[PDB]
Amino acid sequence: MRAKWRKKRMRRLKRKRRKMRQRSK
Amino acid sequence: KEWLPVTKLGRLVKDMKIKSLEEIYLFSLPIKESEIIDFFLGASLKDEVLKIMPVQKQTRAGQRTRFKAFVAIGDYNGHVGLGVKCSKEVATAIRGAIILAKLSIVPVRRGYWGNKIGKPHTVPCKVTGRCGSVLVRLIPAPRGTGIVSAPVPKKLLMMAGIDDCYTSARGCTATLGNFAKATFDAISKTYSYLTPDLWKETVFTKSPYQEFTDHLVKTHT
């Protein structure tokens, strides 16, 4: 697991968490 | 039983023409056989094995293990030396390291702390030594202090003649070979330091290969 796709997946997870936060509030 | 000399210096040593090894160290003549040291210096040569460690390289025959032995030789009011030998059998490595340490011994001079009374006890100045990444410092000490160090350079310093010092080490001290070699380099650099009382213009005597040319031309062939 190289760092580029790990950072891409972590960015997607952060975007999902943030957009869940803005749908919740 | 009887040692036959193979060099000119050994022949002049065995002929009882040369007086001491003092002028041999003065003229920096190399020594290649282990008979001048025990011919001149008496039975004060004390040996201590330091550490016996195994090294190995692997082949189809498993791996071949060889043993490296560290030993130190030298009288307790004078010279000191260090030798490294690697061989297959332990006692052969011990004897080879003893011989190689007996060849490589150096003279040291001892200084004073404050007052120049009695016999000298400490190092004349602050010398240093380098081996790999091991840095050893030798700070002079007042009389009746004792060497404060690790066990290995402390035992080198009691077996080297002096009795009081302050030391400081920096680097990977755990590798005993590099640390012992750095300590030996640091104590061997005692005469490589300028001191203002040695500012008298040096006088050159005859070379030790020069007084006895007529002796050696019919003695050594």
């Binding site: - | 060099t7 003549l29 290969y209 020069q210 040319t213 031309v217």
Partner: protein
Amino acid sequence: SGALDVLQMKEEDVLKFLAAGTHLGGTNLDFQMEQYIYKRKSDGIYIINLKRTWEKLLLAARAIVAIENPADVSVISSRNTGQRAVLKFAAATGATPIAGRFTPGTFTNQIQTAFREPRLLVVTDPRADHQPLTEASYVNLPTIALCNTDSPLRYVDIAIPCNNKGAHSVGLMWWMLAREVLRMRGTISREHPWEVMPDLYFYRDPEEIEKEEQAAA
């Protein structure tokens, strides 16, 4: 060399130098040779001052005669233009010659058969014979070199500046070095020449030997 006027260019040593081509050297200049030089000529050849060459030769002869045992002088030559010269020099003065393939560890390995203990070392060329110089550096051995303008200078105590691509110059300088050593030692008077042959130190190619023996009786 001495400030007294007894050892100088009398009439014909400079003529022998100019006949042998000793005054001209290589096309490249070492930075240690800025004072063993007169002036570069045209087409990039450097001119060696013969007075300084004679002065260094006199100093080297003084260093040779200073010791008293002639068996402690060792001369080295591995180049093909100088095997005969060191053998004739060792026949003249009693030195020890090594001509061709100086084995390593001659002065270090004390258990091999090729183990000699000298007190003064003379070498022909420092560039082609760096192996005797680094071997002699491990012991207390002074070195004398017949060095060139392009020759590097390391582990050399007495340096005589001359060309080495010409066998005539090498043989002439070896002959006159033996001449000066025998003169200053006390065997050859300076009032008359002892010169048996100046070409006795000269290397000859086999084809030139063949045509010489064909032309001669």
